[PDB]
């Protein structure tokens, strides 16, 4: 069986392990490093997708589009802090108007 | 190469009744590569500052706690620990 099944993950372990050794991050890579990293990446992806799905439902849509990813990332206090210096193509902004501009 | 095939599997586990467009998939592909480089780069720094030659689960955990915010880091670290536990037994 594959290492992803052993870890109980969905993301690949071989590819993460391959990239670490091939991308010159250190001379050696341990055995738990790719597994731990893969799990963290998967969890972050799941957290993004969870908020994306919810944003899609509150807009009564059944397919995740760039705008839904934008709403998910910006309507969370910590994901906004993690991706505060990132631009998403075709993503737009959060609808908002300052209180001195409304009639 | 991309992570699309894996993103589908994760997507169905949080939402069965949904799809995803090629642009959104492209964004997720960039997101995975960005978070991977940030964590691996930070783990590289941690190993280098400590004069280490090996990136281990401990190194990644320190990098993750540094890179991710609080509550999110708590969830992320929990998942990482669980994964390495099932992997080592």
């Amino acid at each position: 069986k594959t290492r992803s099944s052993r870890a109980g993950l969905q993301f690949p372990v071989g590819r993460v392990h391959r990239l670490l050794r091939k991308g010159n991050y250190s001379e050696r890579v341990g055995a738990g490093a790719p597994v731990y990293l893969a799990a963290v990446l998967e969890y972050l992806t799941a957290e993004i997708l969870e908020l994306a799905g919810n944003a899609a439902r509150d807009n009564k849509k059944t397919r995740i589009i760039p705008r839904h990813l934008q709403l998910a990332i910006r309507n969370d206090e910590e994901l906004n802090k993690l991706l505060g210096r990132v631009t998403i193509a075709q993503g737009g902004v959060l609808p908002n108007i300052q209180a001195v501009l409304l009639p | 190469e991309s992570y699309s095939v894996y993103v589908y599997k994760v997507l169905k586990q949080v939402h069965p009744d949904t799809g995803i467009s090629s642009k959104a998939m492209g964004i997720m592909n960039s997101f995975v590569n960005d978070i991977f480089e940030r964590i691996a780069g930070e783990a590289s720094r941690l190993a280098h500052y400590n004069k280490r030659s090996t990136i281990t689960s401990r190194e990644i955990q320190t990098a993750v706690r540094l890179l991710l915010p609080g509550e999110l880091a708590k969830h992320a670290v929990s998942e990482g620990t669980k994964a390495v536990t099932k992997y080592t037994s």
Binding site: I65 | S4, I20, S21, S22, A24
Partner: peptide, 15 residues
């Protein structure tokens, strides 16, 4: 009436 969006932005296909 939302199937019109597929013409403007297609669904990713894994096969």
């Amino acid at each position: 009436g939302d199937s019109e969006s597929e013409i403007e932005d297609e669904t990713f296909n894994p096969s």
